[PDB]
Write a protein that binds this DNA or RNA. Structure first.
Ligand SMILES: [Mg+2]
Ligand SMILES: [Zn+2]
Ligand SMILES: [Zn+2]
Ligand SMILES: [Zn+2]
Ligand SMILES: [Zn+2]
Lengths: 158, 64, 114, 384, 87, 1136, 48
DNA sequence: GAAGGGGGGCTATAAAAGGGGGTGGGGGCTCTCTTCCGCATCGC
């Protein structure tokens, strides 16, 4: 916890030549700084595909455990964040495809899938298998299909 | 929202006169004539119907 | 009282005297130009400054719809009956309630004070 | 929280939503402090102005003025009802002022029972003529406007704010100085309970009828205003023709405003007095003004005759537009209407320009009230 | 100039430790002349050598919206002081 | 043909009806927002420079076109769906529309090959949508369609829904930009100061202000006194004042003749010439443009290392930072010289006394920033941030040699959250920069009453800070006529600062001056760059939006042509102001937003252009297509702003002021449609407001906002935190014409009451009221209080989560003495269950790091029935529950009631029908008010309404109480009342209810519209007896809802000192607040360590533990001494 | 800061020592009662 | 010339080998009181 120095007001606040003598200093930990950047990346991806804040919060918690567990220390943080975002969607019952997560992430599908496997191992957790009905609402709504067509597609696949 | 059952001042029953009052106005009656036709002589009772706003009709438009 | 600029660099000409001739001269500072002075008055300061307001009045005010119009003060020049009257409303007068009349006839911007 | 009406004045309290705080002392020593030092009866007379801080108020003050009129007579049954509300009553019914043809008690007789002890007080009614003291009826007042309480009995006079309000020498003040706080406490409550219950008989209202005046009065008010308009026009012509000589110590603009304001102020005073004369003895506006309960002669004149000049910062309505007060006036219009003189009464209603200029004047009072609360608060703290 | 003292005769930055050394050498009798009781106020004590840390009750953390303490402004400031002096 | 006076009253209200049928009442809100979405957003994106990347390959990005879709909500599964406003309110969503932009990406690879790709409709964020605006879902829906969506057709819109909170942007009042204003400061060192707040077209980088000031003569000196007063200029980004003549030299005008030609347009005037002489001498040293530029640069924002940098910096400031509205190009020096000379010329006229000083309170010199300009200001900053991070992101990838994905470069949070945050909190600007952020711009919409809702959507905020005190801005300026309500203003610190629009007032949305400038060029207007300065004297300057465009030698013809075009709507739109200052030889044309205007009837030759044919066409407003806009097209009615009103000769009415009479004004230009339009929404419901003292009208405008009624027709669907609904609202028996347009009949906020003005039992004294207990038993002023409680269960943290469940006293750690039995198995109380104080309606448990109790406790005073229990997912996707508790409020003693004339009063007692006084007909008053409330207040309109109400009820006709109506008089009303067998003055013989005896005085009694105010005693009664204490000070808590104690402040403390009650003073300030004990060392007065358990007391510092004294002091005194110790002070408590 | 806590109307000294919130206090609306003595106050049963 | 088809690469799985490169983590608004400067005055 820390306080940031505000903007100068009078002449006493400014050095002999313009620049303010009291300047903010970067006192954030490297671990916290990286973790802060990952959460910013997690929210940026979530907004791209309009994910609710509860899924983002689950993703942020997932990243903190993986980041602290340090089994994925060799992998890029963005890939871990992308994989955590994928896992959070599965855990919440609204899975996104690896391609859908890759579209909102600079990380490729292959690297997300690899980090996804490691995160599950590191967390000693699992995700329920995806079913055809887990995507019907989003796919049909994005295609602008009526509810009757969506129900028919859901029944056909099941 | 709905026509009060009694006149606030004297307690005369006015809740059975709103539909009749509306019908009389539909029959080209003036408001004063319609109130007289309904027997509302005291201006306290005439106040009840003359100034009533039937918002319950609007509320019935919203589906339950 | 008048203001002059040197014909050379068009800067302000300021008064100056020449001892040899003892005649007032107007000399430009940044130019060295000199000119013979004909007014002989360096400046006049008007404390009362009873400037004739009629000069300050604009004949176009007759076109103002919000100014009152009177037919009881015919124009002295053209004889037009209708005229528009108003007060100076000019600061530094220290007192102003008299009316200034302007003829409403177009092309006759005559102005007077009763 | 339920309060007696008399303590509203010391608290500066009203019943339009005011909230008051209760503090319960938690020990005998602090309980005794409040009892012996801070109880309301001990607070009746303030050391700030060596006079009572609370008196008789809106209904009781208006009714006690009616009650103590010379021609108020009470029947046997009415009197016995009032004595039920007199806590200090000795239980003896006084001999009626009139015994035949019917037993009738006067209002002064019943009020004499309320007056504590045997105090002696001399006051004048608000409507007491100045020349009556020099006339042949100094001690027998034709109007009953001389208040004499002798030996604890109101022998003559109409009681009003002057003899029952928060003024030095008031009958309430004498009771405190003579009888003490405890007896004066009962004096306050007995006046209210007795005259409040008599007001149930006599009644008191205010309606449109009290805001109207005789057609003769309206003509007099209209003529006075019409003359005032011409007088202001004449002064304007003099100023326009440079025939106005500035008064020493004032500029020409100040001289013109003084003359115009003097003319319009006199017209407002003349119209106001004309309205007041037309009022009958039954007028309820006059009833609450003579008693001192509420309103003033200015309020009556404004309601009946003319609201009068509207001022902003002590001057007539300024030329907020270019040389005019509103877009509905010509430029340089110094007439009474252009600069905010309301020639209508509240009953008649204000014209749109008068309504707006009146709103400008009212805004000044609202600003002052907000300013006065904080400006004076800082002064109080620093003095303390 | 703000929180800094400059001594000009040429011009140097008058450090608080410099002022501390000057004040430490003022005699008790001289301090009395300056209107300072030596036993209750020495000029050097006006230089912050050791900073008092208020008790927790002076800067208590308030609980709101779950079991997440929100530290006091004084606690937040003390973190900056502890970090900079540690640095 | 022509409207005769016998038909004018009907004719004028047909005109007013058509105006509101078209415009409505929140048109200023909706029009401003529509302009921001339709034009400003596209302009801001277009005006953005293309992003150029170079680090070799070169990438260009251009944002072409903007697209906006319907307000959409995305389910947790990702399916989009249209977001209904009601769903947003219930689920606490933000009513926002997705924003898309077309972006073209062209890359140059240095191989002489160009690859261009367009990313059509790129999502860049979400814009909150104003309800019922062109981009709202409710737009273009019939009243039947709105009901199907659970939306009230009477709801005007004009507000945002941010996190379910209805938010209204208050119009922010500011001084007009690009206009030269000369003011005199009595105390300052400058005798006069002419400022100009110059802003770019389309409101680019914020306004830049330039001051031209004349030094005061206070300074005494042989040289200073002789020369006179010198003029200095305060340019932006310059520390110190710069002499004016230097600025002209820096512009490129060196010779004194050239500079004076731009300042003085008539050298024949010697008085003005002498005024500038002292300024010429001041800058005599500088005689070159480059020298002048260096001089200005020397004072620049940053020191210039070398002269070349100084000159370049000075040119930079003058080129763009000085008078930007005049020009921002490199060839605009001549244009700026003329305008700067005009500023000096204006300053000279003020100093010479030839021109009056400008008035800050004039609303011609004011602009109102509505939602559009407000939102556009935010969007410019956010879009720049969007491109800033797009550049930063793309720079990293282009540096590494790899191409960048455009979609991944865009951060959609920048615009979505930036817009949402400003509306959500009202802090205007940036969250990081909240220090300079304007506050209070966004407020939660007031839903107490429909009139309060309408009023909040038409509110105006003055620039002056509320904390600051100054009478002049708080005064009712003349120029507010027809623009701002003269009565509606809050009482207290905000008197005169918060205002409400007049009923027909309209705020200009703004338009481009290009068509006007082009027409002026086509017309015989000489450009400013082509004329000689000598020609300016005779000609009239032409200003368009504060920019001096040129001069004209025939102003009268030009104004007639301009007026003709605007009336025909040919080239000039209706909201364009054309002002000719005949005396000053200036024509000012204004086209920008924020100008307040009102419609006025045009008068030509003492005749209204409005004839009978227009009225007849309007009468058939429907099935005829004739509307208000046809009146504007026909040229019979035009909008007039405050500046143009100065030049307008206006007739209050046609029936009297136009007619031949004593010659007062034979040249009328305009006419009021009706004088009653000077009032706003709340003042428009006052009957006979021209018969009341003006402060009473202001008080009612405030009280009407607090009157119960039916605030909205769909109140059942809504779940508002607080809501008051009257059982039986009535429309007033005595109404105003303006009330038809406020929808007051549709949503009344009061009841018509038989009111007797009598002194009955003393229980109505001092603004108190006696109510009829029997009438209250019949539903008279019965109201419902609805209170909604929202609770959200959120899981955040490694193992911490919140759930809805019934907390068992053993399982859960936290617990209270309340009752948890009402809760259902799912932790939620059920509808239809009676709940009292200290009852749990939501069972919330947070897992302990077994589990703490965060359950929601019903308000202690509240005793109602659970009405609705809504469960859903909030905007964050968490389970969300709203519970509405319904409590019926029967009028009690202490409840506030007001008439429509500022006569508020609590109920002092309630008598039954038999106890109340009765007329011979058995009528008892519902309410008795004291006669003493009338005389001082002078609320004569109250008496007239009572008299008119009696006639209305007997006659059967709603009475008309429109203010300035000669057709209605007290005598006329009195004559009508006589016809119904009543005393003509409204008095009646009343009988005492206790005794049955006639009251000696006849009582004024009749129907009056009263309104129950929100303030109910049961919501204010509060008692404290040893409650909880706050952590910091250990003193009683604050607030009724927290069981806090009442403050015993300094004034009460001072009062008890005068009483001499030392012990009671000690009780209040010590015993009843924070009694505390400390142990103090005797040697040193510092607090010692005390261990009562071990009975060991030590003073670390004295090395003593035997002499320690116990001191009883307030805890706050302990905190003070400890806080003083934190500052190195040593408060030593000595017991000897 | 510490200085801000002590100064002002709401500061430690004026806001918590010269004046403070107290127990055993009640607040509610006031209404007339002509049947009470000048030295009496009518009090709700809930407050009592 | 659009569209379906065929062939082939990609994905993961383990494991070893050795080195380059990628990734992350340290480090060089008003009123009142006080202070400074210019001036004229004497003094020596
Ligand atoms: Mg009050
Ligand atoms: Zn009835
Ligand atoms: Zn020269
Ligand atoms: Zn002429
Ligand atoms: Zn010690």
């Amino acid at each position: 916890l820390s306080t940031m120095i505000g903007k100068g007001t009078g002449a006493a606040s400014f050095d002999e030549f313009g620049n303010s003598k009291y300047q903010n200093r970067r006192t954030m930990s490297s671990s916290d700084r990286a973790m802060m950047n990952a959460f910013k990346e997690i929210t940026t991806m979530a907004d791209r595909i309009n994910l609710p804040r509860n899924i983002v919060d689950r993703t942020n918690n997932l990243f903190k455990q993986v980041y602290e567990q340090k089994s994925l220390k060799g992998r890029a943080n963005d890939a871990i964040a992308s994989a955590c975002l994928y896992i959070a969607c599965r855990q919440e019952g609204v899975p996104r495809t690896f391609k859908e997560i890759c579209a909102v992430s600079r990380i490729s599908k292959k690297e997300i899938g690899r980090c996804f496997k490691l995160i599950l191992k590191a967390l000693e957790t699992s995700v329920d298998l995806i079913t055809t009905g887990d995507f019907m609402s989003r796919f049909c709504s994005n295609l602008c299909l009526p509810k009757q067509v969506q129900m028919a597609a859901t029944h056909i696949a099941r | 929202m709905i026509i009060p059952v009694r006149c606030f001042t004297c307690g005369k029953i006015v809740g059975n006169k709103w539909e009749a009052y509306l019908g009389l106005l539909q029959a080209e009656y003036t408001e004063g004539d319609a109130l007289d036709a309904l027997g509302l002589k005291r201006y306290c009772c005439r106040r009840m119907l003359l100034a009533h706003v039937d918002l319950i009709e609007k509320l019935l438009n919203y589906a339950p | 009282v008048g203001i002059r600029f040197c014909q050379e660099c068009n800067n302000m000409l300021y008064p100056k005297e020449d001892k040899e001739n003892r005649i007032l001269l107007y000399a430009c500072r940044n130019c060295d130009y000199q000119q013979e002075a004909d007014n002989s008055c360096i400046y006049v300061n008007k404390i009362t400054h009873e400037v004739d307001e009629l000069t300050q009045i604009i004949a176009d005010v007759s076109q103002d719809p919000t100014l009152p119009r009177t037919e009881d003060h015919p124009c002295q020049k053209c004889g037009h009956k209708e005229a528009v009257f108003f007060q100076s409303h000019s600061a530094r007068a220290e007192d102003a309630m008299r009316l200034y009349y302007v003829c409403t006839a177009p092309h006759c911007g005559h102005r007077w004070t009763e | 929280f339920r309060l007696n009406l008399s303590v509203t004045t010391p608290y500066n309290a009203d019943f339009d939503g005011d909230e008051m705080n209760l503090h319960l002392p938690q020990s005998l020593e602090t309980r005794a402090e409040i009892q012996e030092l801070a109880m309301v009866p001990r607070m009746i007379v303030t050391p700030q102005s060596n006079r009572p801080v609370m008196g008789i108020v809106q209904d009781t003050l208006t009714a006690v003025r009616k009650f103590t009129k010379r021609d108020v007579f009470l029947e046997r049954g009415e009197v016995m009802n009032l004595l039920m509300f007199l806590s200090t009553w000795d239980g003896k019914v006084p001999q009626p002022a009139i015994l035949k043809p019917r037993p009738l008690w006067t209002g002064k007789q019943i009020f004499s029972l309320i007056i504590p002890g045997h105090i002696n007080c001399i006051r004048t009614h608000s409507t007491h003529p100045d020349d009556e003291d020099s006339g042949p009826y100094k001690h027998i007042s034709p109007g009953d406007t001389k208040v004499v309480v002798e030996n604890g009995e109101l022998i003559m006079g109409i009681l009003c704010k002057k003899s029952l309000g928060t003024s030095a020498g008031s009958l309430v003040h004498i009771s405190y100085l003579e009888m003490g706080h405890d007896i004066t406490r009962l004096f306050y409550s007995n006046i209210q309970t007795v005259i409040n219950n008599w007001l149930l008989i006599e009644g008191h209202t205010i309606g449109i009828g009290d805001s109207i005046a005789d057609s003769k009065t309206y003509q007099d008010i209209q003529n006075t205003i019409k003359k005032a308009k011409q007088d202001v026009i004449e002064v304007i012509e003099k100023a326009h023709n440079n025939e106005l000589e500035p008064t020493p110590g004032n500029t020409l603009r100040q001289t013109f405003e003084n003359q115009v304001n003097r003319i319009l102020n006199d017209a407002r005073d003349k119209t106001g007095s004309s309205a007041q004369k037309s009022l009958s003895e039954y007028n309820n506006f006059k009833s609450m003004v003579v008693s001192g309960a509420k309103g003033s002669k200015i309020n009556i004149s404004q309601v009946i005759a003319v609201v009068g000049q509207q001022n902003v910062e002590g001057k007539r309505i300024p030329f907020g537009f270019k040389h005019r007060t509103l877009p509905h006036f010509i430029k340089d219009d110094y007439g009474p209407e252009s600069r905010g003189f309301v020639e209508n009464s509240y009953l008649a209603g204000l014209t749109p320009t008068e309504f707006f200029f009146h709103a400008m004047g009212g805004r000044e009072g609202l600003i002052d009230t907000a300013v006065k609360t904080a400006e004076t608060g800082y002064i109080q703290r620093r003095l303390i | 100039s703000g929180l800094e003292l400059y001594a000009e005769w040429k011009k140097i930055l008058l450090s608080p430790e410099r002022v501390h050394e000057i004040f430490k050498r003022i005699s008790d009798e001289e301090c009395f002349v300056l209107g300072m009781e030596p036993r209750y106020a020495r000029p050097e004590w006006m230089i912050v050598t050791v900073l008092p840390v208020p008790p927790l009750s002076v800067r208590p953390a308030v609980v709101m919206q779950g079991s997440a303490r929100n530290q006091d402004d004084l606690t937040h400031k003390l973190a900056d002081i502890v970090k900079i002096n540690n640095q | 043909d022509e409207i005769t006076p016998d038909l004018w009253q009907e004719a004028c209200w047909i005109v007013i009806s058509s105006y509101f049928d078209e415009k409505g009442l929140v048109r200023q809100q909706l029009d401003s927002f529509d302009e921001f979405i339709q034009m400003s957003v596209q302009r801001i994106v277009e005006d953005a420079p293309p992003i150029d990347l170079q680090a070799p390959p070169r990438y260009l990005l251009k944002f072409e076109q903007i697209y906006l879709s319907k307000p959409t909500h995305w389910e947790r599964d990702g399916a989009p769906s249209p977001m209904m406003p009601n769903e947003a309110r219930l689920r606490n969503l933000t009513y926002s529309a997705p924003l898309y932009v077309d972006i073209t990406k062209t890359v140059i690879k240095e191989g002489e090959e160009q690859l261009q790709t367009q990313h059509q409709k790129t999502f860049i964020g979400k814009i909150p949508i104003m309800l019922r605006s062109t981009y709202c879902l409710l737009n273009g829906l019939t009243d039947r369609d709105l009901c199907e969506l659970n939306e009230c057709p009477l709801d005007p819109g004009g507000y945002f829904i941010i996190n379910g909170s209805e938010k209204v942007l208050i119009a922010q009042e500011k001084m007009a930009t690009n206009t030269v204003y000369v003011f005199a400061k009595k105390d300052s060192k400058y005798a006069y100061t002419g400022e100009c707040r110059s802003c770019l077209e389309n409101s680019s980088r914020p306004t830049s202000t330039i001051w031209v000031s004349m030094l005061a003569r206070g300074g005494q000196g042989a040289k200073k006194s002789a020369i006179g007063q010198r003029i200095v200029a305060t340019l932006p980004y310059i520390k110190q004042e710069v002499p004016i003549i230097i600025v002209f030299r820096a512009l490129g005008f060196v010779s004194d003749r050239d500079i004076l030609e731009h300042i003085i347009y008539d050298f024949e005037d010697p008085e003005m010439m002498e005024m500038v002489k002292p300024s010429l001498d001041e800058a005599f040293v500088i005689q070159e443009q480059n020298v002048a530029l260096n001089f200005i640069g020397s004072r620049g924002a940053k020191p210039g290392v070398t002269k070349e940098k100084r000159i370049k910096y000075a040119k930079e400031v003058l080129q763009k930072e000085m008078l930007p509205h005049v020009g921002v190009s490199d060839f605009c020096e001549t244009k700026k010289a003329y305008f700067l000379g005009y500023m000096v010329h204006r300053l000279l006229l003020a100093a010479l006394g030839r021109r009056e000083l400008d008035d800050r309170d004039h609303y011609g010199n004011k602009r109102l920033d509505l939602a559009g300009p407000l939102l556009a200001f935010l969007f410019r900053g956010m879009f720049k941030n969007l491109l800033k991070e797009v550049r930063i992101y793309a720079q990293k990838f282009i540096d590494r040699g790899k191409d960048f994905n455009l979609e991944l470069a865009i951060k959609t949070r920048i615009i979505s959250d930036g817009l949402k945050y400003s509306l959500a909190t009202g802090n205007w600007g940036d969250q990081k920069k909240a220090h300079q952020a304007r506050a209070g711009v966004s407020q939660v919409l007031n839903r107490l009453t429909f009139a309060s809702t309408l009023s909040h959507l038409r509110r105006l905020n003055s620039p002056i800070g509320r904390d600051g005190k100054l009478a002049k801005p708080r005064q009712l300026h003349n120029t507010l006529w027809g623009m701002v309500c003269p009565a509606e203003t809050p009482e207290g610190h905000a008197v005169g600062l918060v205002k409400n629009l007049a009923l027909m007032a309209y705020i200009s949305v703004g338009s481009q001056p290009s068509p006007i400038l082009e027409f002026l060029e086509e017309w015989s207007m000489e450009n400013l760059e082509e004329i000689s300065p000598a020609a300016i004297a005779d000609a009239t300057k032409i200003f368009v939006n504060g920019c001096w465009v040129g001069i004209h030698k025939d102003p009268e013809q030009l104004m007639n042509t301009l007026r003709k075009l605007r009336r025909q709507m040919d080239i000039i739109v209706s909201e364009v102001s054309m002002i000719r200052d005949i005396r000053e030889r200036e024509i000012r044309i204004y086209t920008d937003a924020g100008r307040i205007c009102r419609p006025l009837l045009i008068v030509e030759k003492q005749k209204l252009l409005l004839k009978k044919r227009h009225i007849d066409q309007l009468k058939e407003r429907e099935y005829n297509n004739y509307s208000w806009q046809d009146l504007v097209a026909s040229g019979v009615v035009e909008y007039i702003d405050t500046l143009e009103e100065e030049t307008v000769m206006l007739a209050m009415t046609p029936d009297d002021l136009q007619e031949k009479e004593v010659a007062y004004c034979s040249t009328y230009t305009h006419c009021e449609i009706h004088p009653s339009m000077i009032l706003g929404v709340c003042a428009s419901i006052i009957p006979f407001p021209d018969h009341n003292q003006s402060p009473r009208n202001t008080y009612q405008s405030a009280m009407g906002k607090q009157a119960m009624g039916v605030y909205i027709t769909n109140f059942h669907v809504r779940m508002d935190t607080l809501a008051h609904v009257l059982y039986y609202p009535q429309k007033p028996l005595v109404t105003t014409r303006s009330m038809e347009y406020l929808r007051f009949r549709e949503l009344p906020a009061g009841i018509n009451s038989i009111v007797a003005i009598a002194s009955y039992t003393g229980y109505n004294q001092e603004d108190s009221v006696i109510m009829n207990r029997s009438a209250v038993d019949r539903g008279f002023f019965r109201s419902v209080f609805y209170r909604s409680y929202k609770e959200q269960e959120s899981k955040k943290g490694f193992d911490q989560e919140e759930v809805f469940e019934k907390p068992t006293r053993e399982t859960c750690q936290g617990m209270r003495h309340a009752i948890y039995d009402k809760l259902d198995d799912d932790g939620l109380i059920a509808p239809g269950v009676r709940v009292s104080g200290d009852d749990v309606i939501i069972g919330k448990t947070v897992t302990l790091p077994t589990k703490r109790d965060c359950s929601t406790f019903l308000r202690t005073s509240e005793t109602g029935i659970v009405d609705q229990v809504m469960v859903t997912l909030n905007q964050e996707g968490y389970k969300f529950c709203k519970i509405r508790v319904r409590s019926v409020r029967i009028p009690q003693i202490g409840d506030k009631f007001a008439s429509r004339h500022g006569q508020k009063g609590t109920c002092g007692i309630q008598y039954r029908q038999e106890d109340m006084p009765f007329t011979c007909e058995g009528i008892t008053p519902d309410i008795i008010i004291n006669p003493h409330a009338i005389p001082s207040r002078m609320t004569i309109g109250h008496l007239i309404e009572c008299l008119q109400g009696k006639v209305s009820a007997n006659k059967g006709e709603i009475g008309d109480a429109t203010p300035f109506n000669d057709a209605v008089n007290v005598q006329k009303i009195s004559n009508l009342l006589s016809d119904y067998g009543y005393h003509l003055r409204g008095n009646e013989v009343l009988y005492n209810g206790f005794t049955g005896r006639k009251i000696t005085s006849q009582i004024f009694i009749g129907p009056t519209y009263y309104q129950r105010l929100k303030h109910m005693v049961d919501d204010k009664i509060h008692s404290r007896a040893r409650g909880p204490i706050q952590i910091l000070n250990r003193q009683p808590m604050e607030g009724r809802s927290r069981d806090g104690g009442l403050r015993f402040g300094e004034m009460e403390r001072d009062c008890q000192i005068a009483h001499g009650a030392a012990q009671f003073l000690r009780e209040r300030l010590f015993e009843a607040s924070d009694p505390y004990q400390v142990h103090v060392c005797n040697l040193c007065g510092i607090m010692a360590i005390a261990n009562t358990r071990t009975h060991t007391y030590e003073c670390r510092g004295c090395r003593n533990k035997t002499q320690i004294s116990l001191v009883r002091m307030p805890y706050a005194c302990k905190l003070l001494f400890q806080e003083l110790m934190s500052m190195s002070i040593a408060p030593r408590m000595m017991s000897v | 800061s510490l200085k801000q806590r002590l100064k002002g109307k709401e500061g430690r000294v004026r806001g918590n020592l010269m004046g403070k919130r107290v127990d055993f206090s009640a607040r509610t609306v006031i209404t007339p009662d002509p049947n009470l003595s000048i030295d009496q106050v009518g009090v709700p049963r809930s407050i009592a």
